[model samples]
Target: TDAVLELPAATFDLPLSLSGGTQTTLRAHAGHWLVIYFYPKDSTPGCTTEGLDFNALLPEFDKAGAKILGVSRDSVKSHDNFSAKQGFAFPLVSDGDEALCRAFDVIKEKNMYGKQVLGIERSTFLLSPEGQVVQAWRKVKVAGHADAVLAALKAHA
Candidate 1:
């Protein structure tokens, strides 16, 4: 059940556990632009950098009417630690069962130290204020990605 571009947000509606112990759903972000990024894990080298970058630009994103959400197949406990340590202003969504990951189609096969493993593909999706996916990036490179996403958000917002 991969997310389809321009599809309604309700198509992916499902309960989610947020870092601050909040329960929410995808359709809950209906009134504002939503930036959802799926990372490999919490506190990893690349993931940390990505999170920090997003945190740094959060003010701008907010001004543009966008709310950022970082998603991973990590536990709520793990996400709470990472978010607190990084001072991220955004909420981290815990997808322990891969339900959100499967909905976004972010999980993929990867070679980790020469061993094949299935993990998150480091992807991002931008949904319009109307709750439709307007842009998507898969296999994202960590460097300058936050800036790129912000630019796209401003462009479409």
Candidate 2:
């Protein structure tokens, strides 16, 4: 099932990877507006650009009472490396088993380099402080996305 807007999303308590090899969890971020974005892989061009965009606007997001979390089907080790390299202030969730991806229904079939493959489609969900999804963006385009999310957060606030 897909994430429905204005409805509470499934709650998760899985561990997440943070910069400098630290760990966090979804439940730790309760009572704050959440920006959850799903990307295909680590270090890929699109994903990198998207991550950097969010990283750049993190302060503004914080001021708006929102937290950002990036999700991908990569290992925690990979997430650690990527988060450190990108200097991302937010936590990155390693959904290697696709549990979180399946929960959000971001997993989809795609054509990559002339081959069909199952992957996480680039998507973002804005969740209220109460864990209800207020808005969602599927098949996201990287450019101007962070700015848009921040704008939306401010609007909602």
Candidate 3:
């Protein structure tokens, strides 16, 4: 029931010309579920764990007719390296200019040892096939999160 999950508008497109020439973007309105997740960086500890978990659950997500995309400020090259290293099967989108993050409201100021830094605050938004935002999880904890998302997909779908 996070804010992003509550469709701000009926048919909104994720604002990014993502790194990958998507085989999936056109499916946004095609009678299935979409999971849009925002992460901070590639290959970092938490990011790695989260990405791997999502990869591991890809089969389940597929079976449930749900797709997940990871977005970050990292470059497509960084995403490529991370995907190759971790064997992540899903496409991880690149928001090098942070435009997508800003549009999704995931980009924000964060505190690191009392120093403020501009970056994405990890979050996930679930969009139903009819182009409606249905559910979301904000400030997600990396551990076992893919399972939770998978569960939501199954239960909702």
Candidate 4:
């Protein structure tokens, strides 16, 4: 895989999933700091833990001026299910054909059940209110990740 795409200080488009199986762009949330996290799958152990962690800190993230979004190559049906079941305060983006995934360069070759499979490496990007990249965390460990991000946001603010 190539190096991760380093987002410059500029506006960019991110295809996102909405309720009722619709599509939208990140451009809509232009004036808010964005915390877009890319995970491998929905409902799995690591993914679930990460989602819950972020959801747990949603209000603090809001207080710190950030909007959180989770991204994966899952369908809207899957995302709706996961969001509802997990009670995620933030929304999840559906990278149906890997457009956003490729843009962020989160895809990787991983060993899954003794098989080499392409998947999303856990990653997060903090965007400025003007839609520029403020900071990014790639290949993230789930534990304490949200707190780390909150710290970064406070520092950035």
Candidate with best TM-score: 1
In model 4, which regions exceed 4 Å deviation? 1-11, 19-22, 110-116
**Could you give candidate 2's per-residue lDDT for residues 39-154 as a string of tens digits?**
99998999999999999999899897899989998888898889889888888888878877777888898788899888798999987776767788999999999889899889
Distance from true position, residue 118, model 2, in Å? 1.7
TM-score of 1: 0.90
Model 3 alpha-carbon drift over 4 Å, by segment: 1-29, 111-116
Candidate 4 per-residue lDDT, tens place, 85-104, comes to 99887888888888787777
In candidate 4, residue 48 scores what lDDT?
98
Question: What ranking emerges by lDDT with the best candidate at the front?
Answer: 1, 2, 4, 3
Reference-based lDDT, residue 37, model 4: 90
On a 0 to 100 scale, what is the lDDT of residue 67 in model 4?
A: 88
Better of 1 and 3 by lDDT: 1
**Per-candidate TM-score against the hidden true structure:** 0.90, 0.85, 0.83, 0.85
Better of 1 and 2 by TM-score: 1
- Clash list (residue pairs), candidate 2: none
Candidate 3 residue lDDT tens string, 1-157? 4233443442255444454554234245468788888898899999999988999889999898787788888888888888889988888887777765666678778778889888788988777787566777788899988888888888888
- Give candidate 2 regions above 4 Å deviation: 1-3, 6-10, 14-25, 111-116
lDDT of each: 0.89, 0.82, 0.76, 0.81
Q: Alpha-carbon error at 135 in model 4, in Å?
A: 1.0
Collision pairs in model 4 = none
Cα-based lDDT at residue 134, candidate 3: 71
